[PDB]
Design a protein around this ligand. Structure first.
Ligand SMILES: Cc1noc2c1-c1ccccc1C(c1ccc(Cl)cc1)=N[C@H]2CC(N)=O
Length: 127
């Protein structure tokens, strides 16, 4: 039983920019969420082998995690903030698909998502 290869965190043939929104997304949004007591399960790809979740990557075909997003930000992988926000959304959606309402992992995701939305409600001037 193996995990899949993780998502790419660089790609020279994908357009990219440094923008004020993307800088904020790393410096403020990601960095703040990272320090939350409920960040830890979302700080790396799901290790389905270690966690003994053999069906995880049968159900979840578009993995995404904050460790990946951090790397993407640091490497200027994104063209715009919206692309990074989409990744965060995929992370949350995955968690809500694989688990169920009331699970502890879902309480963790819901708290992170609430905080995320608060942080992103106001960004720097778009570019
Ligand atoms: C992300 C993600 N989505 O699902 C899971 C994770 C996850 C990642 C790393 C460590 C643990 C997990 C947890 C989990 C469960 C309880 C608590 Cl308190 C904390 C985390 N759950 C699995 C699914 C599972 N059913 O085990």
């Amino acid at each position: 039983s193996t995990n899949p290869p993780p998502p790419e965190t660089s790609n020279p043939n994908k357009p990219k920019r440094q923008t004020n929104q993307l800088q904020y997304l790393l410096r403020v949004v990601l960095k703040t969420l990272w320090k939350h007591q409920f960040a830890w399960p979302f700080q790396q790809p799901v290790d389905a082998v270690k966690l003994n979740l053999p069906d995880y990557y049968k159900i979840i075909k578009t993995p995404m995690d904050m460790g990946t997003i951090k790397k993407r930000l640091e490497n200027n992988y994104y063209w715009n903030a919206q692309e990074c926000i989409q990744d965060f959304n995929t992370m949350f959606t995955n968690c809500y698909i694989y688990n169920k309402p009331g699970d502890d992992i879902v309480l963790m995701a819901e708290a992170l998502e609430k905080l995320f939305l608060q942080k992103i409600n106001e960004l720097p001037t778009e570019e």
